Amino acid sequence: GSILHNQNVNDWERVVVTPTADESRFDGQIIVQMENDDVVAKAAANLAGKHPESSVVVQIDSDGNYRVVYGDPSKLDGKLRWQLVGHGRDDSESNNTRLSGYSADELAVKLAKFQQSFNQAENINNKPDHISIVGCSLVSDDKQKGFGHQFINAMDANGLRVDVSVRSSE
Amino acid sequence: ILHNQNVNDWERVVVTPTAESRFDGQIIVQMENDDVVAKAAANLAGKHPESSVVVQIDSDGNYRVVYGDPSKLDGKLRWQLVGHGRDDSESNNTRLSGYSADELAVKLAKFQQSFNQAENINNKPDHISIVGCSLVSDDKQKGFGHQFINAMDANGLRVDVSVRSSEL
Ligand SMILES: O=P(O)(O)O[C@H]1[C@H](OP(=O)(O)O)[C@@H](OP(=O)(O)O)[C@H](OP(=O)(O)O)[C@@H](OP(=O)(O)O)[C@H]1OP(=O)(O)O
Ligand code: NA
């Protein structure tokens, strides 16, 4: 996969969010961009463009610092999903895959920490019903679902119980 | 009451078109004989009326096709399981149309092989949506889908699973 840059959120590229016509059962979503890669930043922007009125895009670095780069978190309400956007890469110390440098266990811990910090600062009280993992690298179908089922358990271990889907960015 | 016996006598599904998807086709699996469930299944197929197949299946694993052409299925496939979620009086033993999560997984794995003996599609589904026509709690929904994932994944059938309510 591509080289991993997930440091120093303030420096990150921002892609223009373009609304496109081309009706979801969620009322809002947080699109969580997890590395500073142009393909990844574009896929995050495109997801928000598909639902421009109720999408918030957050970039978050390995230190846990985040920036809202699109949308209004105050407006978030109802049934929410999260879409995580990153590159899945093979690991050399296991047969597990890593999403933007995170293992499923590390990702769940990071996301639980992010949720309380983000609900803290933004002063909103809501939790995702569903989490989508949107991989911009083409890793195999098995390792995709393997990561997802690992992630479900790890999310559960961390106090957030969610449906999870894994797919490839179009 | 639960009516999941004798699929030949079930109310049938009439699908009105309605207005893509990342799935190239789907099987809507109707799990009980009930007007609300039957209407929900028809509603689902109405959203993709040219690539959706509706199947009804009883408590014996016998089934029938009531909408669409199975032989035209291929590509990335979704299954949507439609029924009424009911409480067993054991907290996270919620049952969908009489089936616990384990029994649902066994049933669906048995249906796929049985279905392929006649249609010969053998296309593993990428995704399974459980569509509950009764209001079931958020935690029970997730717990149900979680057990279902585990049974499916243990049996070699690794899929994404989501659990929701239908409109009614
Ligand atoms: O609105 P629905 O008919 O219920 O189908 C949606 C929709 O799928 P399609 O529009 O492609 O048919 C979503 O697609 P997008 O939100 O990506 O545009 C998909 O969301 P995901 O891609 O995150 O999977 C989601 O699937 P799910 O929420 O189960 O993961 C699925 O809703 P259901 O399959 O649950 O009914
Ligand atoms: Na759909």
Author numbering:
A (entry chain B): 3590 to 3611, 3614 to 3761
B (entry chain A): 3592 to 3610, 3614 to 3762
Give verbatim excerpts from the published study on this entry:
V. vulnificus secretes a large multifunctional-autoprocessing repeats-in-toxin (MARTX) as a main virulence factor via an atypical type I secretion system. The central region of the MARTX toxin of V. vulnificus MO6-24/O contains an autoprocessing cysteine protease domain (CPD) and four effector domains including the domain of unknown function (DUF1), the Rho-inactivating domain (RID), an αβ hydrolase (ABH), and makes caterpillars floppy-like domain (MCF). The CPD directs the proteolytic processing of effector modules after activation by binding to the eukaryotic cell-specific inositol hexakisphosphate (InsP6). The V. vulnificus MARTX CPD displays a canonical CPD structure with the central seven-stranded β-sheet flanked by three α helices.
To examine the structure of the processed CPD, we purified the wild-type CPD lacking the N-terminal autocleavage sequence (post-CPD, residue 3592–3796). The post-CPD construct in the absence of InsP6 was susceptible to proteolytic degradation of the C-terminal β-flap during protein expression and purification. We obtained the crystals in a week at room temperature and determined the structure of the post-CPD at 2.2 Å resolution. However, the C-terminal β-flaps (residues 3762–2796) were not visible. In the asymmetric unit of crystals, there were two CPD molecules coordinating a single molecule of InsP6 in the center of the non-crystallographic two-fold axis. Considering the proteolytic susceptibility of the β-flap, it seems that the crystals were formed by proteolyzed fragments lacking the β-flap (post-CPD Δβ-flap) or that the β-flaps were completely disordered. Compared to the structure of the pre-CPD-InsP6 complex, the position of InsP6 in the post-CPD Δβ-flap was shifted 3 Å away from the binding pocket to share the coordination of a single InsP6 molecule by two protomers. Due to the lack of interaction between the β-flap and the β7-α3 loop, the catalytic residue Cys3727 is displaced 5.4 Å toward the helix α1, occluding the substrate binding pocket. Though the dimeric structure of the post-CPD Δβ-flap is physiologically not relevant, the monomeric structure seems to represent the inactive conformation of the core CPD when InsP6 is not loaded to the post-CPD.
